[PDB]
Write a protein that binds this ligand. Structure first.
Ligand SMILES: [Mg+2]
Ligand SMILES: [Mg+2]
Lengths: 161, 161
């Protein structure tokens, strides 16, 4: 009923992602997005998970994650969009068809970056809220999009104001 | 012995990530990084995996992935760094300590973005090659880094030149 966001600090060693995927699958969790990479603490990874569910969802995930010994801190992200930041990044390969200029214009308007060009097309890098990224993707001529590689959402609570 | 990069298109439904994590764990694959999100084809996700291994590594992963019926295309990424693009994104929460100006300068030099500020600190968004992202993170006063949330690597082959 609402998408929820949770950040999670896990001891990083061989076999660990296998474990958290298992726990989430064999608990009936509807995961929409997952991000994973090094954290602020060397030796610990941070995962951001978005899960589609009800208001008991965050408690549930908390309770169940903590049963992996490797799960060392679970941090819910504020449900108020005003209280957090959310970002996604996409790499987009587009072929030109007499429209170099419309495409480059679009990249400029969205503050994207061209990171590869040939006579045939470009690769564009785009970062922003998920709805900026998607709005951008949808504005491209769909027959000309060759490839799209996307991260999930990274999110964090804002500084308290 | 070398890090290898592979892109992979998978049918996206409940239980799917569980499966590919299982196959990779119970095959002895040393996964350094994983990215996942929607692809250019609606209904299919694209995953980018980096795996530390020998020259048989890409074949192996190919052979073994294809045994999940949901794995629908495996694309190795060019091993020549000249032939591909690689990008990572990080969200970084930093506390100020009489050094607003050094920090903002640093963000400008790395073409990062300030996406949250208070009197206490900022959240910085940074995108680039993994060594630009890490060089940036290492340049911050380590006692002042509160939080770091990172995607893995997204990668793609360049247009043929
Ligand atoms: Mg514990
Ligand atoms: Mg098949």
């Amino acid at each position: 009923i609402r998408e929820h966001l949770v950040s999670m600090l896990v001891h990083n060693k061989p076999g660990v992602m296998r474990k958290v995927a298992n726990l989430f699958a064999r608990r009936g969790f509807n995961i929409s997005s997952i991000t994973v990479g090094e954290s602020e603490t060397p030796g610990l990874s941070r995962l951001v998970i978005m899960v589609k569910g009800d208001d008991k969802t965050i408690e549930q995930i908390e309770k169940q994650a903590y049963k992996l010994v490797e799960v060392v801190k679970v941090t819910p992200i504020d449900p108020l969009p005003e209280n957090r930041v959310e970002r996604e990044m996409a790499l987009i390969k587009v072929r030109f068809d007499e429209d170099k200029q419309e495409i480059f214009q679009l990249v400029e308007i969205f503050r994207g970056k061209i990171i590869d060009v040939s006579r045939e097309g470009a690769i564009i890098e785009i970062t922003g809220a998920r709805s900026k990224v998607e709005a951008f993707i949808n504005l491209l001529p769909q027959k000309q999009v060759e490839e799209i590689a996307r991260t999930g959402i990274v999110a964090m609570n804002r500084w308290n104001v």
